[PDB]
């Protein structure tokens, strides 16, 4: 047929016009779905194999069914990604290749009861948590360093000065460094259509603190929209789960100490005034590292300065490279 | 190792 | 005389090297073996 | 010693007197006037070492059993390895010693047929016996006091 | 050694950040060999 070929030739032509021009926004999934395998794409060929936990970076715009994304893997190609309705329906496409998937059961009844799918069969129903396949997550990864003990301590607050000021100085003009005085922690989006939208209603939500919380989500969205990396000097947050549910999903850096025996002496080098809160200190790092490390994204498990320096130059280096 | 990492952050604590 | 002799003494024997003996990478267990087995290898029983 | 039991001193010398062998020297390569027998005939198992027609076990071939058994030389519990490893120790003495005649090795690592009478079989056998007498003796006690209610 | 270690242990670990763009030792003296052995002999015992 001609007018296959001819939607080839247009949309072939779209995206070579299209390969210069800034990205529009980007996606997070939960499902690991290839894009390739699909016919009903409108490209054959120049599909994505994206498995979960992978972002994907939109920039133009091409119908209500499918989109132009990118991968943030280095030397991924443009390729096409399913629309959110898209990704619906081939979900349910997944379980009719099924012999069953409503009540009736094909266990030798067949025949007997035909049982016409009700609307239980259907999306419409399992609608308690309903997790949407597409998530909106800042464009560029935000940067967390999680405290190798309690945030707001000598000790820990020179472990990520540190690596602050390297950020800021070797990385001058390309990353922009904003601090959050107030908690993160509070970030939900499935609790309401608007808990507490104006200040005047004089309600319990109205004049608490998640107001200014939920105002902080939106800005690192938009500075992540101007491609200049950005870190989160977050004080509350103290464990990856704290941050893992929310709609930011950030880089979590782990600066640790090897030894709980050579944190208790560093803790002790500050003088008399952390031996007060050395006792709860140590919680803070115990419980910490006995998380999986799995949840982390990158590990700083080494003592020499310039080492780790230069760890971290390089993994966002090759963050740089990977969306350049 | 650690102290140094101490050592630097805290010597430009100045501003 | 007494402390610094003695730690020539004490570092030239613990640092020496053994004369020869090829370089052993293939063989594997050799550690107390050989002589034993050597032994093993040239037995003769005494004669009355 | 060995040679003292025989005053010819062939190289050959019986079996059973191989168990008053060992008594009579300190361990580790003996087992000691106090070994118990049970404890001995365990480490005669690990040995396997053959038995010639003629009822005798050889100087050299004895040897280094006993060498083998203490020093734990690439001794595998059982099955298919220790033919594997009964190999590899052979590659590795003809690597060392390449002058060794073929006769010498197989007299030092015996090559194993399922058909050869070794002492550990003989000793198996025995054991087998008389934890069967012992078991059998058990089990006549064991009749006869439930039986006297 | 276990500046060895760490280093290889801790590159392979920071590859995988970047996994996206993808000798000899010194003869061992009489003495060490020696104390090997008898190291191993002992905790044979356990």
């Not at chain 1, 107001?211 to 464990?239: M, P, Y």
């Not at chain 1, 790092?285 to 990158?298: A, G, I, M």
């Not at chain 4, 390449?98 to 197989?106: A, G, I, R, V, Y």
Request: hydrophobic share 40%.
């Amino acid at each position: 047929e001609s007018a296959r070929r001819e939607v080839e030739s247009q949309a072939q032509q779209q995206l070579e016009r299209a390969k210069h021009k800034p990205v529009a926004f980007a996606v997070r999934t939960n499902v690991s779905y290839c894009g390739v395998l699909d016919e009903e794409c409108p490209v054959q060929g120049s599909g994505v194999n994206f498995e979960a936990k992978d972002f994907l970076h939109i920039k133009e715009k091409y119908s209500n069914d499918w989109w132009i994304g990118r991968l943030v893997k280095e030397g991924g190609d443009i390729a096409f990604i399913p629309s959110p309705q898209r990704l619906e329906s081939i979900r349910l496409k997944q379980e009719q290749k099924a012999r069953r998937s409503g009540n009736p059961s094909s266990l030798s009844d067949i025949g007997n009861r035909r049982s016409p799918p009700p609307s239980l069969a259907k999306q419409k129903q399992k609608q308690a948590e309903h997790v949407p396949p597409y998530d909106v997550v800042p464009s560029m990864r935000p940067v967390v360093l999680v405290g190798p003990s309690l945030k707001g301590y000598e000790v820990t607050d020179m472990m990520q000065k540190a690596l602050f000021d390297f950020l800021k100085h070797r990385f001058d003009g390309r990353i922009s460094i904003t601090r959050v005085t107030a908690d993160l922690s509070l970030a939900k989006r499935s609790v309401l259509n608007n808990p507490g939208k104006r200040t005047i209603i004089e309600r319990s939500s109205a004049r608490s603190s998640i107001a200014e919380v939920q105002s902080e989500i939106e800005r690192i969205f938009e500075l992540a929209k101007s491609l200049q990396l950005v870190v989160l000097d977050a004080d509350t947050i103290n464990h990856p789960a704290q941050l893992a549910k929310t709609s930011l999903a950030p880089i979590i850096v782990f600066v640790k100490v090897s030894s709980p025996k050579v944190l208790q002496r560093l803790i002790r080098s500050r003088g008399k005034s952390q031996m007060k809160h050395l006792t709860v200190q140590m919680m803070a790092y115990d419980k910490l590292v006995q998380c999986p490390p799995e949840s982390f994204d990158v590990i700083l498990d080494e003592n020499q300065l310039e080492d780790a320096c230069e760890h971290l130059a390089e993994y966002l280096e090759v963050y740089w490279r990977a969306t350049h | 190792g650690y102290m140094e990492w101490i050592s630097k952050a805290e010597e430009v604590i100045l501003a | 005389p007494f402390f610094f002799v003695n730690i020539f003494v004490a570092l030239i024997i613990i640092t020496f090297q053994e004369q020869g003996d090829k370089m052993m990478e293939e063989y594997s267990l050799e550690k107390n073996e050989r002589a034993c087995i050597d032994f093993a290898i040239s037995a003769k029983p005494l004669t009355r | 010693v060995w040679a003292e039991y025989d005053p010819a001193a062939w190289g050959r010398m019986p079996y059973l007197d191989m168990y008053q062998m060992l008594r009579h020297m300190s361990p580790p390569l003996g087992l000691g006037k106090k070994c118990p027998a049970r404890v001995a005939y365990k480490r005669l198992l690990r040995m396997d070492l053959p038995v010639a027609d003629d009822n005798t076990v050889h100087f050299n071939s004895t040897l280094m059993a006993l060498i083998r058994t203490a020093l734990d030389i690439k001794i595998a519990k059982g099955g298919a390895d220790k033919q594997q490893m009964d190999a590899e120790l052979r590659k590795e003495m003809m690597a060392i010693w390449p002058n060794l005649s073929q006769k010498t090795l197989d007299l030092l690592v015996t090559p194993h047929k399922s058909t050869d009478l070794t002492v550990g079989k003989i000793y198996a056998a025995m054991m087998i016996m008389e934890y069967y007498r012992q078991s059998k003796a058990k089990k006549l006690q064991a009749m006869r006091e439930e039986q006297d209610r | 050694e276990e500046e060895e270690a760490a280093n290889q242990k801790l590159a392979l670990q920071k590859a995988k950040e970047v996994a996206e763009v993808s000798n000899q030792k010194p003869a061992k003296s009489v003495w060490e060999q020696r104390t090997s052995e008898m190291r191993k002999q002992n905790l044979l015992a356990s």
